[PDB]
Design a protein around this nucleic acid. Structure first.
Ligand SMILES: [K+]
Ligand SMILES: [K+]
Ligand SMILES: [K+]
Ligand SMILES: [Mg+2]
Ligand SMILES: [Mg+2]
Ligand SMILES: [Mg+2]
Ligand SMILES: [Mg+2]
Ligand SMILES: [Mg+2]
Ligand SMILES: [Mg+2]
Ligand SMILES: [Mg+2]
Ligand SMILES: [Mg+2]
Ligand SMILES: [Mg+2]
Ligand SMILES: [Mg+2]
Ligand SMILES: [Mg+2]
Ligand SMILES: [Mg+2]
Ligand SMILES: [Mg+2]
Ligand SMILES: [Mg+2]
Ligand SMILES: [Mg+2]
Ligand SMILES: [Mg+2]
Ligand SMILES: [Mg+2]
Ligand SMILES: [Mg+2]
Ligand SMILES: [Mg+2]
Ligand SMILES: [Mg+2]
Lengths: 254, 243, 54
RNA sequence: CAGUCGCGUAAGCGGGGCAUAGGAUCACAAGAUACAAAAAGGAAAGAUCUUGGAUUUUUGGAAAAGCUACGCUAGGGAUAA
RNA sequence: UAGAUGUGCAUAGUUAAACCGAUCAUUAAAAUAAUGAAUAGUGUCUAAAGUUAGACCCGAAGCCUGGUGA
RNA sequence: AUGUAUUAAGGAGAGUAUAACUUAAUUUAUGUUUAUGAUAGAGGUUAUCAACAUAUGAACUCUUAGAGAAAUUACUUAAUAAACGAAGUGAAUUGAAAUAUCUUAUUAACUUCAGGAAAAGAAAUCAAACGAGAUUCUAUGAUUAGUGUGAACGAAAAUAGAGCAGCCUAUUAAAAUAAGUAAAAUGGCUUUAAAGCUGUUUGAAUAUUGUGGG
């Protein structure tokens, strides 16, 4: 079929409430390991710093005087002390600060983005939830933390405990790999929760996600809005002349 | 196992790396494919060097010159103009101007000194259109007019075309009038726009004027000629008879 | 302007470059008709071309 | 093949000599071509074709004399005693 | 919200060059008389390369400028 | 190594609680917060068991009055490195497979002057018959136009980005709008023959009511 369904759950209870429809060219693409490779290696090149530096014989300190006479000494002739053959000489072909970045067509990078989403979709590792995706911390703790009654030590020890038993109950913790939460904007509870308990998972903002980030953990828990915005910004090879992008099949039962 | 530990490029994409001077069994050791103690091994030979023999460019010399004043025209064939109208990418009901030709993708994405209509596929072109270009072939003019259309050749420049696409200049297939009897209606037309528009330039050179001044090219200055006048600004049609 | 005491022409207080900047700035705000006579005015440039031509 | 001349009744022959021994580019000079003409009209300086002047004789084409036993460096034993 | 904007390459060939153009050039007028030239590009990665930079590495005698020393 | 922020004179000698720094070489005070901090004791040499912020005493000699063999003399409330900037002067190695033009190269270096930056700067500028609108820095344009016998050298328009600011009543105190000037010949520089710089000898005009430069 040209379109595929996408279930939108309520994050805490994981109740399927709504049903959206996307194109098969969005979440049902074939697995292209060569295209995913070019995108993953393309991001690493741009992340690299590339600032290593070594001195050549033209940059090593000292005078360029001739060390020994050209002949008469019985030893091997020598020029400057900065030669690579000498003790503290310069590395001829040593590292220099340069740009390690490579190029990748916007259309290939957009195909690798939807190919990574399709890899998670066809495997059941893509969970779309309703907007407002945050960890439902207890109201009692939230009331204390704001009040300032709780110390930093206890405040962090509780979040680490609640987040652990919460992820372990959902089978989303360190035992079942990990989970990557993707939201449109930063959320205090979600990001603060996984900043203190990172073994159970992590949280990212849509602007900070990469193709590699969509393949590291065991599942991708993304918001309904972030997914639509993620695919809408990575379909350059498709919208060139549209297809189903968030077509609501079943509305939430208000 | 992990997806990230299973990605690779196609095997045909990978090619052997040759690191020279790294042992005899590599096949490139101890000489790196240079030979034995020659100029090509010690130093470098200039690329233009032939050993001393004079190159042909000297014994024969360079022929001709490169024209630095010729206009670079974008070539458009009727074969392609028909393919666009049928596909629905060019509206034949409206005037086809350079703005619509450039924004259609029929001449590409590069704007040049002008657009010339050529007559490839003139046997199958039967669509009535109203096109305006900088130049046109004698075959294209007949093909356009035979199908029931109109064609006009107007003076353009590389800078005028950019302003047309950018919307800074409005298209017009008529020259700027001359005389104190048109200053009012022209100034009023400018005030009504309420927006700063650049005028399309008119030809200034002898050749450019003569081109758009003759009816063979359907030039937009041909109306300035008399039925017996010549387009040339210097030459005249001689008279026949006994005198 | 020609100085009366000294028969020497004084350069205008606004150069032809600065004249065109005001005309351009006055046209984008709708006060171009409030400026004095200038060979850079959009109507004067156009009138001189239509009346006299090339 | 086209152009247009000669000789020959004609067929036909003629794009020098019975054959084998005369160097370019560049620059310069003389003719033609109507190509381009740095705002525009012209021009200058260029382009194309024809042609001319060379022990450019180290003749695929540098404007060019010696000493070193006060000698120096890189090499060769690829050439000596 | 909408509009515009940002190198380049290719898309048509031909000639010394323009006009011209699926035809163009030579034929001092032209003319199937003759001869030549026509149909997928573009970007990226991997690798090997040409060019310019020290340019695979080591090694002169010497030349110039500024200073030092009786 | 790059980026960001801040700043805009540097060293030496000798002495001293050997973490503590100037013959005072561990000065004297103020405010706030102090374990919910900051990021109900013991301890003045068995010391400095307190951090932040704001003040404060002291701070020698030479470079650096004169002189001299710098850290001395003799006097006295004597005092400013480098790098970077502009102009002036200006090579050679090297490449051309030699070599003079050329290239190396408006380079290195030297001298003078100047500031925290300096320089440049609001068109006698570019464009081309449409228009742009000071200077500076980066990229593209561009192994281009072009120059040169060659080897090689090599723009501008425009575009993009960094910044953006216009004025003479200049936010620091200046013009009665510029004559030995523009320009020419000649000798050179630069350079494409133009424009620009210049020694010598000569030497204009007065504004779009078309005067002057390009
Ligand atoms: K040396
Ligand atoms: K072409
Ligand atoms: K001149
Ligand atoms: Mg080292
Ligand atoms: Mg790589
Ligand atoms: Mg191979
Ligand atoms: Mg071998
Ligand atoms: Mg080889
Ligand atoms: Mg090889
Ligand atoms: Mg060897
Ligand atoms: Mg060899
Ligand atoms: Mg001209
Ligand atoms: Mg020879
Ligand atoms: Mg021979
Ligand atoms: Mg002797
Ligand atoms: Mg003194
Ligand atoms: Mg003293
Ligand atoms: Mg040579
Ligand atoms: Mg050239
Ligand atoms: Mg003046
Ligand atoms: Mg002068
Ligand atoms: Mg001059
Ligand atoms: Mg001048």
């Amino acid at each position: 079929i040209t379109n595929v369904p996408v279930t939108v759950y309520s994050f805490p209870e994981l109740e399927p409430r709504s049903l959206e429809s996307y194109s098969a060219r969005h979440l049902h693409l074939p697995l292209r390991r060569d295209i995913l490779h070019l995108a993953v290696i393309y991001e690493g090149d741009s992340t690299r710093r590339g600032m290593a530096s070594t001195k050549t014989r033209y940059e090593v300190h000292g005078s360029h005087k001739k060390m020994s006479p050209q002949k008469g000494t019985g030893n091997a002739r020598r020029g400057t002390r900065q030669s690579p053959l000498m003790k503290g000489g310069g590395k001829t072909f040593g590292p220099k600060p340069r740009d390690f970045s490579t190029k990748l067509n916007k259309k290939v990078y957009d195909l690798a983005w939807r190919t990574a989403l399709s890899y998670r979709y066809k495997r059941g590792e893509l969970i779309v939830t309703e907007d407002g995706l945050d960890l439902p911390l207890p109201n009692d703790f939230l009331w204390l933390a704001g009040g300032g009654k709780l110390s930093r030590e206890l405040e962090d020890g509780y979040v680490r405990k609640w987040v652990h038993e919460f992820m372990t109950s959902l089978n989303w913790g360190k035992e079942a790999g990990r989970t990557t939460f993707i939201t449109g904007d930063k959320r205090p509870n979600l990001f603060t929760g996984f900043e203190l308990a990172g073994a159970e998972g992590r949280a990212l903002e849509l602007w900070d996600v990469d193709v590699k980030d969509l393949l590291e953990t065991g599942r991708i828990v993304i918001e309904r809005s972030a997914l639509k915005e993620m695919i809408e910004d990575h379909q350059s090879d498709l919208v060139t002349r549209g297809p189903n992008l968030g077509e609501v099949l079943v509305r939430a039962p208000r | 196992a992990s997806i990230l530990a299973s990605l690779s490029d196609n095997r045909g994409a990978y090619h052997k790396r040759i690191r020279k001077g790294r042992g005899p069994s590599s096949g490139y050791g101890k000489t790196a494919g240079r030979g034995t103690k020659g100029q090509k091994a010690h130093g470098h030979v200039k690329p233009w060097f032939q050993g001393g023999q004079t190159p042909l460019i000297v014994s024969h010399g360079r022929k001709g010159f490169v024209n630095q004043f010729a206009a670079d025209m974008s070539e458009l064939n009727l074969e392609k103009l028909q393919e666009w109208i049928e596909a629905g990418r060019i509206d034949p009901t409206k005037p086809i101007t350079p703005k619509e030709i450039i924004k259609s993708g029929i001449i590409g994405s590069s704007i040049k000194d002008g657009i010339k209509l050529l007559g490839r596929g003139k046997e199958s072109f039967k669509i009535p259109v109203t096109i305006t270009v900088s130049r046109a072939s004698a075959s294209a003019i007949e093909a356009i007019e035979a199908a029931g259309g109109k064609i006009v050749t107007r003076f353009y420049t590389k800078e005028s075309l950019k302003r047309l696409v950018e919307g800074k200049s409005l298209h017009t297939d008529k020259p700027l009038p001359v005389g104190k009897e048109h200053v009012e209606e022209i100034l009023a037309q400018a005030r009504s726009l309420k927006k700063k528009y650049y005028r399309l330039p008119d030809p200034t050179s002898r050749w450019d004027i003569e081109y758009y001044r003759d009816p063979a090219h359907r030039g937009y200055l041909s109306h300035q000629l008399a039925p017996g006048e010549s387009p040339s600004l210097y030459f005249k049609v001689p008279t026949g008879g006994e005198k | 302007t020609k100085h009366p005491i000294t028969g020497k022409w004084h350069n205008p207080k606004y150069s032809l470059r600065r004249q065109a900047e005001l005309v351009k700035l006055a046209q984008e705000h709708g006060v171009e008709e409030l400026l004095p006579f200038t060979r850079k005015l959009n109507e004067e440039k156009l009138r001189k071309r239509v009346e006299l031509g090339l």
